[PDB]
Structures are given as C-alpha cells and as structure tokens.
Symmetry: D2
Subunit: 237 residues, 4 copies
Amino acid sequence: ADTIVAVELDTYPNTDIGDPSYPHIGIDIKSVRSKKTAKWNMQNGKVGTAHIIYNSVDKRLSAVVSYPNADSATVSYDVDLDNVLPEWVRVGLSASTGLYKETNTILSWSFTSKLKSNSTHETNALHFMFNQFSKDQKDLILQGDATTGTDGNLELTRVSSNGSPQGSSVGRALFYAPVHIWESSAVVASFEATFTFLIKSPDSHPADGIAFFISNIDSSIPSGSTGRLLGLFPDAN
Amino acid sequence: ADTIVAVELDTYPNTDIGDPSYPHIGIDIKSVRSKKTAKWNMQNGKVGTAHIIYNSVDKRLSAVVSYPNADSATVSYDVDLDNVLPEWVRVGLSASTGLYKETNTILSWSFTSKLKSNSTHETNALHFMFNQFSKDQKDLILQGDATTGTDGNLELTRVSSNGSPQGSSVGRALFYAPVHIWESSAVVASFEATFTFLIKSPDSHPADGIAFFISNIDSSIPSGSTGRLLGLFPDAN
Amino acid sequence: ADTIVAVELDTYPNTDIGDPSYPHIGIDIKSVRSKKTAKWNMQNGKVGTAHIIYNSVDKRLSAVVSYPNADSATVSYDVDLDNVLPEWVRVGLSASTGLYKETNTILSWSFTSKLKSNSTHETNALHFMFNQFSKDQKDLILQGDATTGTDGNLELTRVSSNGSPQGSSVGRALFYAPVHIWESSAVVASFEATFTFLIKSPDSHPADGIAFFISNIDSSIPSGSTGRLLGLFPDAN
Amino acid sequence: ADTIVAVELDTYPNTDIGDPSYPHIGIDIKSVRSKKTAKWNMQNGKVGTAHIIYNSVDKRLSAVVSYPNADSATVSYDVDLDNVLPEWVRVGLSASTGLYKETNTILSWSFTSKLKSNSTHETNALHFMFNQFSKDQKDLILQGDATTGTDGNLELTRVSSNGSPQGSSVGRALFYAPVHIWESSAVVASFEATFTFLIKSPDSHPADGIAFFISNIDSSIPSGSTGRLLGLFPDAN
Ligand SMILES: [Ca+2]
Ligand SMILES: [Ca+2]
Ligand SMILES: [Ca+2]
Ligand SMILES: [Ca+2]
Ligand SMILES: [Mn+2]
Ligand SMILES: [Mn+2]
Ligand SMILES: [Mn+2]
Ligand SMILES: [Mn+2]
C-alpha cells in the first residue's frame, strides 16, 4: 500500500462518503475523507492557481487557491509529516473524471524543497519549474491517461480532438527524481509548491477534481480509483 | 516614533522589565517586553545561526536559533503584520552592550521577500545575500557604532584594537532598499531571513543581545537605547 | 560626467551621427555611437523581450531581443567592464522621443548579480524582479517623465490620457540600491538582465528608443539628451 | 559509445596520448585528447573549487578552477552543444586512479539549468544543491566504486578504512533526473555547475583526475577506463 498526503481541489460533492455539499479544497492524510476542508468558489473555464506550503517549525500544511480579482480559498492542518511519510518521497499531480467530466489541464508547475541540516551554510535544495510541457518530457513519470505537448500543456485526463473532456479517466504526473522530504539532523525543513490549472466542462457540470500529492517513491494508480477517489486511494475509507 | 517588529536574542536577564531569569529568544511587537519567549542556552564563543520565517497564509512569525550538534530554541507568535507595519519597510540587525558586554559579530546575512498579486501571478521578489562584508559596503546603512570590513565581518557594537568588547555601545545595519512587506492585493506574501553570529564575552555575564528587526523606512537609533533596550526602543514600556 | 555602458534598442535611424540605416540594437560604451550594432526587425504594437548577460571569465556583453514566433537579433562585444565602470554602480532603463514618437512601456524587469570571492561558497548576491509596478514604487528612482502604476506598468516617456505617446519626452527608472558589479578579490562575477517591452507608434513612425544601462551611483538625465541621445549622453560625440 | 562532453581536472601528464607536461584543466568533446587545455597548479591536500558555465548566445564552454588566496586556472572553448549532445542528457562527476592514486573527494555540488522557449518570457528551470551527502542518497545514481555518507562527503574512487586511496579505481555519480539541455524553440539556454573537491596523495605523484561531464541518459562506465581514461572513454583516440 502507498502512503499519500494530498491537497484535493474537489469539483463534485460526494456526500455519500463525507464530502461537504459544494466544491471545496481539502487536506487528505492517508484517506479520501479530508481532515479539513474549505468552500471553493470554482470558476468553470477560468485559469486558477494553487499555492501549497509547509515547514518543520510550525508543522502546518497550508494551501491557497485563487482566480485573478476573485477571492481566494484557504485551508490549513497541523500535521508532523515526519510521523506520516517516508524520508524519501516523490511529488506529483493527479486528476480524474467519472460519470461527469472536466478538463484537468496543467499550464505550469513549480516546486522547491530545502533542508538545513544543523550546520551553518550546509543546505540541500531541490527546485524545478515547468512553464511549458513538451511531447517527450523525460523528467516526468506519466501514469494513466496523462499526456504532454497538447498546446505545450499537460493534460492529466483524456480529452478528445475537439478539446472535449471524456468520462472515466485517470492520470498522474510525478517528477522523475526522489525528494528528501525530512531528516532527523535537519534544523529546518520546508517545501513550497505552485501550479496553474484550467478546469472546464461544456455541460457546466464538472467532476471530479485535481490533487497535488506526495507519495512513496513507487506509488502507482490504484485499481478502481477512477472518479471520486481522485486516482489516489484504493477505497473510500 | 518608529514601528518596530523584532526577534531578540537576549543574553542578559533584566527581570525588572519582564525578562525571564535566563538568556532567551523572544518576539517583540512594538514593545521591549517580549510577547512570547523561549529559553536559550547561549554558548559563549561559538558561532550560532538564526532563521526567521513568516507568511500571510498562516500569519505566524517563527524563529529558531541553534549551534551545530546542540539543541535548538524555537519561539512562535501569531501576528498579522498587516495591522502592525507600514506597507514599505526597511529590515536590519541591531545590537547593544551596557554595563556588561560581549561581541555582536555578524558573519553572514541573507533575506528573501516575495509578494504574489491579486491579478494572480504578478510575483515580485527581492533577495540579498551577504557571506562577506567589504570595508565600503555601499548597500547598507550603518547606524551608531556599526562598522564592516572588520575581518570581512560586520561588527554591530564597538570592539577594541585588541579585539575586546566595549560597554555602553549601540549599532545597527539596514539594507539600503525599502521592502514591500505586504499589499492589499497579494494572494501570498512571505519573508525569510538567516544570519550567523559570534557572541564572545570576557566578563561574568554577557549583555545585552542581538536582534533582527523590521521598521519604518526612516528609523533611527532611539536616544539612550544602549543596554537593555537593544538599540530599538526608547523606553521599557 | 557619467560613465554609461548601455544596450540600446534604437527605433530611429540617425545616419548623420553614425546610426546604421534601419532600426537596430547596439552596445554603447561611453558614447551614443555603438561599438557594435545588429539589425532588428522591430514589430510595432507587439511585446518584446530583451536578455542581457555578462561574466568576468568570458568578458563579453551580449544581448538578445526577440518577439514570440519571430526571429531574434543578437549582438555581443568583448569588453572588460573593470576598465570602464566603477566598482559600485546603479542599473536602470532609459527612453526618449523627439520629433517622432512611440510608447516606451515596460511590463517586467528582473536583475541578478553574483560575486564569488576567495572563500568557498562565499558568494554575495542580489536579485530583484518586478512583474507589476505600483503607483508608489518606493524601490525605484524615477527621473524625467517616468511614472509607474499606470495599468500596473512602468511608462518611461510621456503618454496622454487617450493613450497617445508624446514627442520631446525623456525618462529613467533606476533600482534604489547600489550594485557591487565587480570586485578585485573575485574569482567570478556576472549579471543577467531581462525586461519585456511594448513600443507602439500610432503613426507607424517610431522614435527614439529604450536602453538598458549601467551607471555611476548619482547619474541624472543630461541636459539636452532628448531624442537621439536616449537620455544617456549629453552630445553625439 | 556514449556521447561525452567533459571538463577534466587532470593531475597526471600522459604525454603519450597528448597531455601537456604538467597537471591541467581541459575541455573534452567526444575524446580524451582535450580540444583546449590550461596549466593548473594543483595543491595536494587542499580543498579547491571548480566552476563551469555555458550559454547558447555566445556558445562557449568555460571553466575556472581555484584555491583560496591562490591564482586560478581558466579554459574556454567555442562549442555549439546543439551539434554535439542529444536534447536530453544526464550530468555527473567522474574520477579514476591507476598505478598512481589520490583521493577524489567531493564536498559539495550544485547545478542550475535554464531554458527560455517560444513565448514572451517562458522559462523552464532545474536546480539542485548538495552541501552534504547521506548514506543513502536516493537522487544520485552511483556507478563503480563511488560511495556517499563518508563523513557526509562523496568519495568517487575507493578509499581504505584508515583513509588511504586505492589504485585501479573508477566511480561516477549522475544526478537522477534527465536534463533538457537544449531546445530549438529556445531564445536562450544556459547552465552553471559548481563543486568543491579534495585530492590528497601519499604517492610521489597523484593520479588520475576528476571530471565534470554531460552524457546520454543511459551512460555507464566503459570497461577498463581506470587510470588515464578518467572513467569516461573506451580508448585514447
Ligand atoms: Ca468529491
Ligand atoms: Ca535583557
Ligand atoms: Ca537612433
Ligand atoms: Ca592524464
Ligand atoms: Mn472531498
Ligand atoms: Mn528580553
Ligand atoms: Mn543607434
Ligand atoms: Mn589530460
């Protein structure tokens, strides 16, 4: 089994399994049933941005989602990732569609993690920034229905020639290199993530959502995780 | 008067003004009597490191102070700087000695400020890093007894020709350019500062401390602020 | 007088003072008569990008100006800046109009300088990035007709309410803090500059140009530097 | 065979295959016989620093190697990597010993690559920094006798338990993720690499050297490339 820690941008309310009755953003720790959630005033057809942050001093996983000139949605949860996740992990982006669908497009993605290990001036750091994706992005691990190059964008789920969303689709993108998320010797550890997305459904009835996640290096799409399980969990517990 | 937000590294206990009875680390918001403090096992003669962090999402100001292979001191305070400070500020380092003394030497200093706009993605940033100080450091505003180039180091208080600390001394060093610490349109705003220091004392007990501060662009050293006022406050209120 | 090292994006061909007979880009060292020019196919009304780079190992100042989905113009010049400029300088953008005119709008500006001394890891660095300009941009020194905040942009020369450019106009924007561009104890030194611009002439007959420049700390606009002198030089010698 | 572009730090003079008669730094493109070399005053037992740089505008690979308060060695070669290397590559460090030996210890290593493509300032970037190596560095591909965690350093060739180097040794360390080194839609492309090293030898003469290299993704050690071939080439052609 994998260990997933995610920040879902949930477009469809699945009250049958704990989702509030409106689109929302939330923090998921080893389960699809969020530990915290916030109402999200999603805008069909508009590009948004998600900013997720974390540091080992405060120990709070926070996220902000916004649209230009609109209001932002924020969610936070006090969690000590050292007691939840492996020391080495992989970071990625995931999306799905079920009976209902939307386009789960990624226009840009950035990530930075730093580990100050006790010593002065002895810091390990990792940073990548994709402002454009190519047909053969050799530094990404594509899973499910994910593809790159489509207008220099990253399409996580299946979209037809006529730019139309398809149902029952799941796709993930993981950065190639493993990331050292925490350590014991470190005096300060922190990470920062950011992405811009374009979710649009012609019927104006979207599903199911996008999720930024952190997992064990060898994570793969669970069977049956289409739709409401955001391609991250095996069951809805 | 000036608007001061500071993180003090207080080496002497002036219990008559609130100081706990032991060296400490504290967060000062417009008053010398810390809002929250933490015990700090200062190590005479050793180079230590401090890291200060803040972001508009969480609205918490945190600090960690350590020496390699030893424990760390942490102190945090929930404060919405939008209500305390002006939109444009200057950042600096301050230090003082009174009846007792110590060296207040800075070996390195870095700062990073970031502000993401309302019309999402209009990120503006400022970053400076000093791992060495020149005799004529034109990008710093030195106030009081502060001098640079002294071994490639920044001395905040007066040291003698033979390297011995001096009493009744105050000095400050401010970066030349004003910083846009916050905005009403920003989605996310955050800063991070790091400095290494060497505090050495030849007498019974060290005094008085070093402090990282944020002020109004035109801040000057308050009259008589040597000793327990750390070059930042005019009175002990 | 002042010491000016500049990269001019010259819109009007003044053959009488040495300008080639078409819009061009050139390297200027203390004179308006470029040491090296390259033909530039200016595109009226379109946003362009200029990248300027330099390092002390190669001792080459190069510049690339381009427009999306269009070919670019490059120009380089071998010059040891240690012999031309002072140690501490100021960086900026300058523009002008004369009999003919154009809009000289800047949409973004970033600068990074690094100085690696004789100390392992001991690099000093400065970085600033403006992706949006405020009405009261306290970290800039505006000279002449330059203003900011107008559409979140920096307008180097005068533009009337109805968006119409004006003639006989001059303006300059310089970053507030002095920059240590070179140092004798340096193993390596280098800077990188980038800005996006919009030059539009409703008459389809533009003049005079924009320039990225490096000067002495207290540089000011020369008397009678309007038009062909781009606000940089006091004569055409 | 693989495709190799390397910057060598050659401690032993093999004049029989072209080496100058003294320790040197050189630029290798597909062959062990450097295209250009420069005399290097290697200091046995001391920590040195290597700095490599390249950009697509000037098309010249340069390198500087130095020790604190000592002169530096510099080498440059005009080379269009677009014509030598594939689009996707891997970067690493390589070292070897033969009949003679030395320690090929790496104390830190950083790399930064930037790629600006077909848009109004659309950059892609990758940055990594190791100021300390762990016993299990998941983001590095170790080959041959290379090992990490050894006092937090990286030892490229075999060292004895007491601390003495072994002969006939070879080892490499490549960063885990592929790097998009060049692209046809790019306006500008550039990279910067830096590492500090420690070569000590109890022998009458040290051998054989360290090399910073760039190769095809699936590169591995050529059989018998110990000694003078520096773990990079099959033969001496
Ligand atoms: Ca749901
Ligand atoms: Ca005190
Ligand atoms: Ca002209
Ligand atoms: Ca050799
Ligand atoms: Mn949910
Ligand atoms: Mn106190
Ligand atoms: Mn000209
Ligand atoms: Mn050689």
